[PDB]
Design a protein around this ligand. Structure first.
Ligand SMILES: CCCc1nc(C)c2c(NS(C)(=O)=O)nc3ccc(OC)nc3n12
Ligand SMILES: [Mg+2]
Ligand SMILES: [Zn+2]
Length: 313
């Protein structure tokens, strides 16, 4: 219980910042996650033997895909750690515990393909889960790993608390379905602006936690320009593979996913920043003012993508 993780000084300091990059050393990422748990939650939240064994089972069930991989999992967990640390009195003990685990597990066993591709392929998961297909699978894989012998990091919780935390994780992971994001943010926008938003209302908390999950999940748009620019190559590599597989089914993919139309990437990016990312961090900043650095960094990067379109770089 007196065993803390420490990081080297540059990491110890930079990890507190929203725009932190977890680096290219895979073997430090589990330590980075435990560090964040111990500062965000407490050193008693989880039994270290169980946490370490949960983390390495989760890692093992991320696939070697260009973007939706173990590095994404830990990156999205760090963004949630930054939001929680900057807003530390707004969230319960259970929410701090649940949300970091939810972010680490939110893309478990992702294959690099969208819910639409699974559906057009007629993948078995699409018959099992008619909506939020991959996201119901991610939650399912989470529960699977929790029920492995020695992996139940929630074993010290009461019956009620256990059921609450699994319900926090389920809604948190389902909210990473971008199809649900548009309506969720619209409702929050309305609630904030008419003054009706109330964080003691569980259905309002749910929506706000949903928006936090979207903000963490898209946090690659909030990094320093060189990180954001290079992450775009990994995202587009999955898009083009999915476009290829669409063509193999006899379906012309949208232009964003067609590797024969790579000149129309910079404009595909702009639409995504204006329709999804900017509104997401704007509404989030309105509800959680300390999350403003995410909105500012997102705007800085939109400005960098506009430059790329003009041929200024
Ligand atoms: C994986 C789909 C969701 C997603 N997450 C991120 C971080 C991005 C992103 N960022 S970047 C680093 O600037 O390329 N660009 C995207 C462009 C289009 C798009 O259409 C769905 N999604 C994008 N996206
Ligand atoms: Mg996902
Ligand atoms: Zn994700």
């Amino acid at each position: 219980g007196l065993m803390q993780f420490t990081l080297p000084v540059r990491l110890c300091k930079e990890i507190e910042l929203f725009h932190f990059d977890i680096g290219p050393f895979e073997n430090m990422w589990p330590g980075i996650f435990v560090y964040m748990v111990h500062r965000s939650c407490g050193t008693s939240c989880f039994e270290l033997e169980k946490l370490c064994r949960f983390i390495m089972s989760v890692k093992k069930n991320y696939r070697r895909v260009p973007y939706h991989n173990w590095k994404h999992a830990v990156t999205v967990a760090h963004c949630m750690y930054a939001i929680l640390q900057n807003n530390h009195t707004l969230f319960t003990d259970l929410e701090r515990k649940g949300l970091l685990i939810a972010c680490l597990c939110h893309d478990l066993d992702h294959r690099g393909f969208s819910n639409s591709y699974l559906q057009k392929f007629d993948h078995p998961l699409a018959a099992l889960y008619s909506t939020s297909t991959m996201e119901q699978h991610h939650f399912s894989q989470t529960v699977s790993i929790l029920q492995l012998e020695g992996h139940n990091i929630f074993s010290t919780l009461s019956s009620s608390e256990y059921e609450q935390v699994l319900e926090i994780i389920r809604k948190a992971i389902i909210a990473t379905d971008l199809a649900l994001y548009f309506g969720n943010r619209k409702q929050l926008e309305e609630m904030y602006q008419t003054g009706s938003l109330n964080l003691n209302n569980q259905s309002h908390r749910d929506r706000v936690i949903g928006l936090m999950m979207t903000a963490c999940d898209l946090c690659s748009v909030t990094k320093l320009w060189p990180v954001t620019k290079l992450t775009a190559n990994d995202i587009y590599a999955e898009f083009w593979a999915e476009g290829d597989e669409m063509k193999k089914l006899g379906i012309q993919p949208i232009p964003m996913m067609d590797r024969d139309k790579k000149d129309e990437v910079p404009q595909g990016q702009l639409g995504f920043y204006n329709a999804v990312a900017i509104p997401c961090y704007t509404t989030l900043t309105q509800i959680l003012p300390p999350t403003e650095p995410l909105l500012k960094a997102c705007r800085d990067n939109l400005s960098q993508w506009e430059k790329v379109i003009r041929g200024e770089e």
